[PDB]
Each structure stands twice: as structure tokens, then as C-alpha cells.
């Protein structure tokens, strides 16, 4: 759902605060071919430590769920650069699959990804994403087999997001491998990446989408609201320019 060799920076809705994401946003817009925007969950046992310190700042100075819509719903007035929705399934769950995806529709998000969705409820969920016009994005780790790669791909109407277990580990380049030798769809990965020959490595292995978080989110739990110059100058130095 983005352009071939394109950077997509995902940052965690919230922190330090909902208008210092909106302000991030808008200044990585112009080298984004996609935006993940994650929800803050007080568990985020699937994600590293970076990542999980972010949630828990967010989380401290008081996110709340809708706000993400907000977020999004504002960011929506100045860009139509595709939005992913990243969470995990309590918020969603608790609040209901389908009023949830039918208010993210509403706000202008293009895909979501449910980062713990339980196996054997991955069918009904497809099913009503589809109805609510949202495409879906699915995970897979180095420890995907093969046969599971081409199930998920079936599933997947958005992109299939390759993340590592926890410079790039060789797993994570097999995996890589792998995925394009069997999806369909394009394919994103967030191996960590932190310096230029990493985007370059990937891309050149087949990867048509890098996701660039925890370099980023580093930034923020260091400059807080101040970090935006900061992350154009970090997104500009992976950008090669």
C-alpha cells in the first residue's frame, strides 16, 4: 500500500504527548511513503525494550485511546500519506472489533495491524475489516515457517510486516528471503535499523518497505517535545541525502 523503497516511520500515539505525535508527523510526512502509529499498551510484551519504554511514557502522562483517533483525524486535514494503526488486541477487544475498526475508518486510517491477534480469530477479524474497508497487515517473525508465511500473505490485503525476534542477524535476512520468494503482497521489515547501509542492505535484498521505529522513538524519550528536528535529520541520514 506504499511505494517501492520507501521509508515508514512508525511512533507510538502519545508520546510524550497527543500534540507532539500530530507535530512529529507532519514534519516526517514528506519523506514517508507510509506511517505506522502505534497504541499504547501497559503489556507490549511483543516489542523491545525502546519500544516498550515509549508505551509506558505515553501510558505515564495520561493517553487515552481515542486520542489516537484525534491524532489521526488532524494529521488527515494536511496529508493523505497511508496511515497503519498498530496495537495490541485488548484496547480493540474490549471496545469491540467492530466499532473499533468502523471509528478508525471514520478518522481516515488506511490498514491496522494487531500485533498479539489469537490465531482463531484471525478469519472473523479479515472478514469484518473487509467490511469496514480496512486493510489488514500481518506480522511474521523469524521463526514463521514457510507453509504459515503463505497463509498469513492470503490474509494480508495491505502488507506483510517481517519484524525481528527482539548489525541485522542473519535470521532476519533469511526471513526476508523467504517472504519474497513466497508473498504476493509487498513486504515491510523493522529489523532494528539505525544507519544508512542498513537501508540500503535491505532494499537491495527485495524488501519493498523499511520501517523505522525504535531509532526513532530513541530520539523522543531523549528530546521530548523538542525531538523533531532531530528526527528529520535521522530520517535524512537513512534517506542518504
Same mark, same amino acid.
Given at each position: 500500500? $506504499?511505494?517501492?523503497?520507501?521509508?515508514?516511520?512508525?511512533?507510538?500515539?502519545?508520546?510524550?504527548?497527543?500534540?507532539?505525535?500530530?507535530?512529529?508527523?507532519?514534519?516526517?510526512?514528506?519523506?514517508?511513503?507510509?506511517?505506522?502509529?502505534?497504541?499504547?499498551?501497559?503489556?507490549?510484551?511483543?516489542?523491545?525494550?525502546?519500544?516498550?519504554?515509549?508505551?509506558?511514557?505515553?501510558?505515564?502522562?495520561?493517553?487515552?485511546?481515542?486520542?489516537?483517533?484525534?491524532?489521526?483525524?488532524?494529521?488527515?486535514?494536511?496529508?493523505?500519506?497511508?496511515?497503519?494503526?498498530?496495537?495490541?488486541?485488548?484496547?480493540?477487544?474490549?471496545?469491540?472489533?467492530?466499532? $473499533?475498526?468502523?471509528?478508525?475508518?471514520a478518522?481516515?486510517?488506511?490498514?491496522?495491524?494487531?500485533?498479539?491477534?489469537?490465531? $482463531?480469530?484471525?478469519?472473523?477479524?479479515?472478514?469484518?475489516?473487509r467490511?469496514?474497508?480496512?486493510?489488514?497487515?500481518?506480522?511474521?517473525?523469524?521463526?514463521?515457517?514457510?507453509?504459515?508465511?503463505?497463509?498469513?500473505?492470503?490474509?494480508?490485503?495491505?502488507?506483510?510486516?517481517?519484524?525481528?525476534?527482539?548489525?541485522?542477524?542473519?535470521?532476519?535476512?533469511?526471513?526476508?528471503?523467504?517472504?519474497?520468494?513466497?508473498?504476493?503482497?509487498?513486504?515491510a521489515?523493522?529489523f532494528?535499523?539505525?544507519?544508512?547501509?542498513?537501508?540500503?542492505?535491505?532494499?537491495?535484498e527485495?524488501?519493498n518497505?523499511?520501517?523505522?521505529?525504535?531509532?526513532?522513538?530513541?530520539?523522543?524519550?531523549?528530546?521530548?517535545?523538542?525531538?523533531?528536528?532531530?528526527?528529520?535529520?535521522?530520517?535524512?541520514?537513512?534517506?542518504?541525502?
Amino acid at each position: 500500500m $506504499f511505494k517501492d523503497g520507501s521509508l515508514i516511520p512508525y511512533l507510538t500515539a502519545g508520546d510524550p504527548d497527543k500534540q507532539s505525535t500530530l507535530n512529529f508527523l507532519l514534519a516526517l510526512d514528506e519523506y514517508a511513503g507510509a506511517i505506522e502509529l502505534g497504541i499504547p499498551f501497559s503489556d507490549p510484551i511483543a516489542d523491545g525494550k525502546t519500544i516498550q519504554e515509549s508505551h509506558y511514557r505515553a501510558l505515564k502522562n495520561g493517553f487515552k485511546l481515542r486520542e489516537a483517533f484525534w491524532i489521526v483525524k488532524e494529521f488527515r486535514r494536511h496529508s493523505s500519506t497511508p496511515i497503519v494503526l498498530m496495537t495490541y488486541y485488548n484496547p480493540i477487544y474490549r471496545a469491540g472489533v467492530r466499532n $473499533f475498526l468502523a471509528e478508525a475508518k471514520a478518522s481516515g486510517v488506511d490498514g491496522i495491524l494487531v500485533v498479539d491477534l489469537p490465531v $482463531f480469530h484471525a478469519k472473523e477479524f479479515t472478514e469484518i475489516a473487509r467490511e469496514e474497508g480496512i486493510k489488514t497487515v500481518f506480522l511474521a517473525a523469524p521463526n514463521t515457517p514457510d507453509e504459515r508465511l503463505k497463509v498469513i500473505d492470503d490474509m494480508t490485503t495491505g502488507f506483510v510486516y517481517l519484524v525481528s525476534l527482539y548489525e541485522i542477524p542473519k535470521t532476519a535476512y533469511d526471513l526476508l528471503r523467504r517472504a519474497k520468494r513466497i508473498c504476493r503482497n509487498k513486504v515491510a521489515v523493522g529489523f532494528g535499523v539505525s544507519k544508512r547501509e542498513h537501508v540500503v542492505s535491505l532494499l537491495k535484498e527485495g524488501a519493498n518497505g523499511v520501517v523505522v521505529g525504535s531509532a526513532l522513538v530513541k530520539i523522543i524519550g531523549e528530546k521530548g517535545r523538542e525531538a523533531t528536528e532531530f528526527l528529520k535529520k535521522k530520517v535524512e541520514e537513512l534517506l542518504g541525502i
